[PDB]
Amino acid sequence: ARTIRIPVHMVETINKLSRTARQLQQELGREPTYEEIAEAMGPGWDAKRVEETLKIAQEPVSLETPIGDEKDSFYGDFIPDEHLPSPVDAATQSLLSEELEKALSKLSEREAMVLKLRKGLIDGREHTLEEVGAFFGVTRERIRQIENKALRKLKYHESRTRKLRDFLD
Amino acid sequence: AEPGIDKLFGMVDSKYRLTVVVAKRAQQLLRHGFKNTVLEPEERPKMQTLEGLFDDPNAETWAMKELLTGRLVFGENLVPEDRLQKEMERIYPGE
Amino acid sequence: KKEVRKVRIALASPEKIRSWSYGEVEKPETINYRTLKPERDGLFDERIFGPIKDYECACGKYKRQRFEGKVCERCGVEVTKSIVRRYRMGHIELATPAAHIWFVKDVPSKIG
Amino acid sequence: PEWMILEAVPVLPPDLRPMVQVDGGRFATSDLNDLYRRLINRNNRLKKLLAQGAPEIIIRNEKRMLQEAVDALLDNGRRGAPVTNPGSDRPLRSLTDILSGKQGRFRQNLLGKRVDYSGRSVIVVGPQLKLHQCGLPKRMALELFKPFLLKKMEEKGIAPNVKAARRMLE
Amino acid sequence: TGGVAGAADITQGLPRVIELFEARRPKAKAVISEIDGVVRIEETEEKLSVFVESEGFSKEYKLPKEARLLVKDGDYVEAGQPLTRGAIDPHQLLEAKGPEAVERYLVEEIQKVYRAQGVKLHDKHIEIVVRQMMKYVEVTDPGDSRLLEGQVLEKWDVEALNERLIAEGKTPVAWKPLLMGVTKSALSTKSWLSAASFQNTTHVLTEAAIAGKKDELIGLKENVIL
Amino acid sequence: MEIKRFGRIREVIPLPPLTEIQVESYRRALQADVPPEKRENVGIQAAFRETFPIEEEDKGKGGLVLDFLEYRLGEPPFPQDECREKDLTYQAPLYARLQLIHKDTGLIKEDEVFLGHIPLMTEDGSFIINGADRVIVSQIHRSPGVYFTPDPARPGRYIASIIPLPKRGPWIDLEVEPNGVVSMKVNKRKFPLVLLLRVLGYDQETLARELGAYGELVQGLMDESVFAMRPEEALIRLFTLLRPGDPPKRDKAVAYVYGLIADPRRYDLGEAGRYKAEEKLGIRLSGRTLARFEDGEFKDEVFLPTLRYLFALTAGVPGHEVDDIDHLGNRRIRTVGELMTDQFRVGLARLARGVRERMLMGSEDSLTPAKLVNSRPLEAAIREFFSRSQLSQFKDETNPLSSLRHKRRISALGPGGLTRERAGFDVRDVHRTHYGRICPVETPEGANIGLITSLAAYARVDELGFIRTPYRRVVGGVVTDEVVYMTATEEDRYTIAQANTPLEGNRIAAERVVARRKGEPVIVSPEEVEFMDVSPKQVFSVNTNLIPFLEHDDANRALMGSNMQTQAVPLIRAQAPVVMTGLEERVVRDSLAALYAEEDGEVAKVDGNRIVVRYEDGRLVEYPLRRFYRSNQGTALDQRPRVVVGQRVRKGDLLADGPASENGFLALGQNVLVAIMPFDGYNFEDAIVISEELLKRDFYTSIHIERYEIEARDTKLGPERITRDIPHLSEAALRDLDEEGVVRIGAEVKPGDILVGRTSFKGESEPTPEERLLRSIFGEKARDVKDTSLRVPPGEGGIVVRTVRLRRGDPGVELKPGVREVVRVYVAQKRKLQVGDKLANRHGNKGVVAKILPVEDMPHLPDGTPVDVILNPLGVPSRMNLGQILETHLGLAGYFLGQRYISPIFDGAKEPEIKELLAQAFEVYFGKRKGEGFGVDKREVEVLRRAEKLGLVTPGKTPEEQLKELFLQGKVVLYDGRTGEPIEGPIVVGQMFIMKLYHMVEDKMHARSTGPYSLITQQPLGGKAQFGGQRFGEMEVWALEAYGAAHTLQEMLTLKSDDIEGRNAAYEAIIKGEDVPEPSVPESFRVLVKELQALALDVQTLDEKDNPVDIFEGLASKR
Amino acid sequence: AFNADFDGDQMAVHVPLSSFAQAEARIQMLSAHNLLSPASGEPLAKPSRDIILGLYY
Amino acid sequence: PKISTSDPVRQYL
């Protein structure tokens, strides 16, 4: 009986609330607060809590709800996208790339590939690259300086011909 | 109005061909710089900004100026498919 | 690269239906008040319809873009452009068939 | 003539029926998404009941309830529509309602799309104007022509690059 | 100004134009002769009937007490001609003088309305529209399709000559002509990708999917929706 | 100054208190002043005394017997304007004593239980709901009573409809069947009538054809006399139409209902219907329906005459009326009170329902006080009204007048049939009974015409709810002041005469007297008259009554006037007009535009802020001068004092002007020297030109307060902040900010500048596969916060006046769920006149400022005085609004005469007196041109020639007095400010009064290059900094098809809307300087297929040779 | 043609993008090539108001 | 053909 599946005791928590709310609606005359409910619900209940068990409790809204005009506009009509890149973004998030193969293209395939294993292939490599000998190379107190052979190489060609400065904001 | 609008109408059998001609013509005319321009140094379009006459970036406006000299030729068939997609690249640098 | 000139519309053979689909939705579940992730074999299961976020999977074992199309061992979630969620068809299998209503109530009752 | 009868029900891709979060930890979704759940519990509950090999009477009632269900999804209203239990008595916008824009959507359709290089303003007469021109706010133009403008800014010394050229303007 | 009191009043303005485009038996339906002939008017003090008679036949139209007489005892009434004042029903005049007569009637009583409000618009435009109004035929002599079937007149380029001629051999097709208003003349398109739009889709698609109807995108609409 | 008052039609009474409809209804809809314990019913008391005593007690084990005791309300939680700031609905707490009675007799007193508290009306007319100001538009409907109607479903005879007004009540229609019997519509469930007539306690042989004496074809009656015997079985033999069946043992189940039991009536204790049913049918009441106390069946005084008058109507000509639903005797207004009263009736229809519930669910001994009586079903019921009711809306307050017109509104929409059924030409038509009851000339333009409507100046709503206009009774041609407020119906009983009958004191001095006789105008003799029109005014709304020379103004274009004064927006040099109608002062007072003195006294203090006054009784009361306050519509409401220190003063004298009052005088616009004439196209079609000089005088300047908000929400990605530290590239662009988020009160803001800085978590933890490589180089803190700072929307902001920083709402401000804090900012801007600004006059002239010339160019008078505004004249024959010329003339006088006038609505200045006023004005102007030593110009010679030829002036008369003629016509002689030569022919200059129409943000200047996009459909969408695109509707689509604009159309249909892929493809090309590419499929189509797809129909797109083509390139294809 | 006066009628403006669209727009939508009317044949950009009032006099 | 539709409840019972 809900568009979002919920644990069976989580239903009973709200089904205790639903029972508890009616008493405090008449016992106080007014609508009780988040502080008012915990001190009545059970020993281990918080003020901040209820707010979450109430956000959780809701319907929720139907994209097919009509909006004021009643005739044409539905609720969903006014909900924007932000997952997809926009014409401005997408183009930026491809001019940044087509400049990277025009930035570290004249770099070593380890001054670039280390950062293309650390960052150019998606996995943190915080404590994953120093252990594995990385196929053919040298490890230990030198990889924590190989990103000084690699990451700090990108600083100058960026500060001189200021290509990458503006791509921040 | 626009230059010799009437005369440029007469060049074609129908309204729309001249629109197809002009646009397509302009496409090439502002694909390969303006390197293909069958229109001489002195009969090129110009602006007035910064106090300096510099050639008009308006491709669409060039092709019209061009066709108006009859230097182009147009038809339903003139060349094959990708067989033109190489000829104009070599005669006029396709970079 | 062949251009389009006609638009056919015909009936759907379940085989054809089952052709388009990408996996039986078996569960009445949607999303999770906790993880906000879709449910396994549920209406939003990334397994069936496609990854939520671009170039990734559900569990998170295969990343980046080079491997443009590589089903995962732990989840199976194809690592290809998330947009594929707004197209990719799913289906429900039926313990008994039930007549499609247009061909039943629209008169002349096309089956009647 | 059997393909008219359904045994494999296809299911609309999820994105065009989304489950987005809006304000105050509350969500919004489609009726389609709630029309499917009610279907499944019934097909799923049938598999139990049939597996169990229960009496026919009840094996029936569930199929009645399954026809009623697939009906209300394909075309909800051709037998007295179901609604979102409490809330209100609004019928659920079914794939049928959706296509033919049943509820003021086909009237919304012809109100057209929206266009990405457009603008609007009040009109003041322009006598000095010649027949083939108009008085336009430069203010307006620089939105409208933005991307065309950013290039000329790059072509000229006005910007180093487009992001800076766009930045120059926000 | 100074008219209506309890009698038959003709339609005027936009109603009339919709009345002429979708037509539609009009308000004051005028009587018209089924046939050529000459006039004889017999009458009781209350009863009235007009007789149109060409040698063999005798046609009798019993016009109501209210009716106004547009024709003189012993005149020639070319078939289709109105015997009362008012308004012709096009279907009636279709059945009696065929296509071109209905058409130049249609076009006109239409243009009549506009020009009387001083709108000068070129006959051809109304023509074009009435033409489609007349687009469809309804098979009488079958050839390989069931009896009635209303459908587009010009699919008869090759498929009317195919009886001895082009695809060679078999039965020749005959067809009744059809007057249908702009509305109804639209729901009957080749294009299901159009016909979907117009008044209720449900039924259009049922029938389109059964037949496996291909939509040649020919009209501007189909190409736009796509 | 001198204000010469005009006209003589001596008004025996000024217009009533104007917001009457709104204030007085609510006063009696609550009753909380003189009322002691038991006092009256009409209002809320009724909603109590109806649902009480609620009873659900059986003589078996227990039950419910709950009776009404008392009600009360008091302490409004928060003071008036505090509700506005804290977004709280200004209201009061409503208590009620109840007490429960026991089956073994016991009285434990449930005292004051305020489980439900109600809103309060402001002093001026409106309400405060969730901060905002609102109005409750009173509404028109078909009255309660019995009416007789002809049948459009059978071109012939009549139908008899009994109509009450309960909130679930029954309709009783009495028609004769197509099969020659008697239909009786109780619901839609029709049945042969006769049946019930027996149950009324009346048989078929006591009064049958006796009172059916004209029943000569009474064959709806004939069928079953072998049925009419006993009412015990006749009451059973009716229950037939009831599903799905019931045993008739307790047969008096629906029978008991339609007697007295409160729900079949139109009013309690008879009345309302009985009021009309005094002369409609019989005479009196049975109780309130067909009421019977304690007898066999049920007494009837209602059903019996209902037939027997349909009889009398179907008889020759006795009684014999056929009803008019357009008639105001049959149409009532449901006021704020009633509309809300029958909303408290619907609340106690659920509170009582909850009480019965706790009898099985609840005990019978455990719940003694009230463990079942709940506020929640009353609490939501009223707020679904005041907040959500159609009939409630935003308060118009563009200016004081607009704020007063809104309380005086009438709609047919809401609960009564609306638009979808239309009933056009009917209803929407101005009815013969509207004289002095509704303005025939006030209504919205377009769709909602004749539906929404405004109450005539003198109009009044009586204790029942019928609109009354006042008439003074006249006897024997001697007119008395004894003035009566007749109804619609009372009116039809007399021969009333028009307001402008020539009089001689008391006495009529007229042969033929021009009079209405129940609508029809007839020239009559004095002896026949009985009542006379009070004022020409009483025929029109107030907005209408403010237009001088109305009589010369065609109604269409004067409607526009009535309307546009709503869009007057207080100038900061608000002027009252040069020619006035009379209602100027009286509006400003009744509106509460200005601040008046409530007793006689001496002024203590005066500053911009407040005034303290010492009244003759000893009271030193302080009046704040409500200062720079924000209206609903932005327009600044606030007072400005017109009194100095220790200035002795009378009661009702002016202390502070309105925002649009110039000494108690309604000050909506500005008076200006207008030349009317064409000017070089610059006023081509209603366009208007403007002397720069108007701007230097700050003439059409206007101060506008704009309110912004920003939220601090809790998030699933972690709380977002209102920090001054936005992460970007600037610090020199944070100056005016500093204030720990907020922008400093006082700063200039242009578009793009930041009102409130904000940082939000966005991206889903990780840095972009590209930006992870990026930010490292700079120093990858790469803070997980974003620039969601509240920015200045494009197209002007202004300078800051006030910010409001509300965190956690701990002072008593109701928070928003999952929202930490909210910042407000307020931006003010003086808005001068400008090319685009629109301009209007009360005679319906509306045009846009198409050119602001410098004064070096303007046409000037001989004394060098140039003109302010140039109004093309072609916008006038076709309109037929001559009042604008009768205004421009009188102006030309009062200008030099140094005066202003009061013409009244149909009385007022006449053509003689005005030329005569121009005669004295010709002295001031010209009769002192020679005493300065100057004769006539060499160009006046040149004109006068051409003038006398035009046949304007006398040939022969002197070049001096030729001009005087010419000036009495209104035209003077202008010199083209450019050349210095004259305008051939004279031009009528003169003063005219003009108002700057108000700015809506819908009709703000808009422009999109590109921005956001709807999630679902993926069509372009609006932000706040971003304006969406234009709807490209079907109609515009055809536009280009027609044009053979092929590509263009398609790119409006893809590239610039739904083509997800191609729009990106496009952008890039344009940036690079490449030519735009061709486009993919639009989500329009893709999503289309998928919907069909979903419905089990295979939709293939075949190529040339019928081979599927991939519209979803890759993606959707399997394997 | 537009049927617009200046008591505040608003217009909307679009930009045609593709070098073809502008081609179309100039050769077949430019307000100085569409002089006559599709309905009548008669010219539809004519002296109108002030323009006549001037010329007549 | 409309006498009753919402039988599912009644029908079963």
Ligand SMILES: Nc1nc2c(ncn2[C@@H]2O[C@H](COP(=O)(O)OP(=O)(O)O)[C@@H](OP(=O)(O)OP(=O)(O)O)[C@H]2O)c(=O)[nH]1
């Ligand atoms: N073709 C066409 N005409 C329209 C349209 N809308 C209005 N008109 C014509 O313009 C004239 C006046 O229009 P309005 O603008 O209403 O007049 P108004 O200034 O007095 O309000 C009318 O005829 P008129 O007075 O005879 O015109 P004219 O002689 O003033 O030009 C009317 O028929 C339209 O969409 N198309």
Ligand SMILES: [Mg+2]
């Ligand atoms: Mg702005």
Ligand SMILES: [Mg+2]
């Ligand atoms: Mg006009």
Ligand SMILES: [Mg+2]
């Ligand atoms: Mg207008």
Ligand SMILES: [Zn+2]
């Ligand atoms: Zn995985």
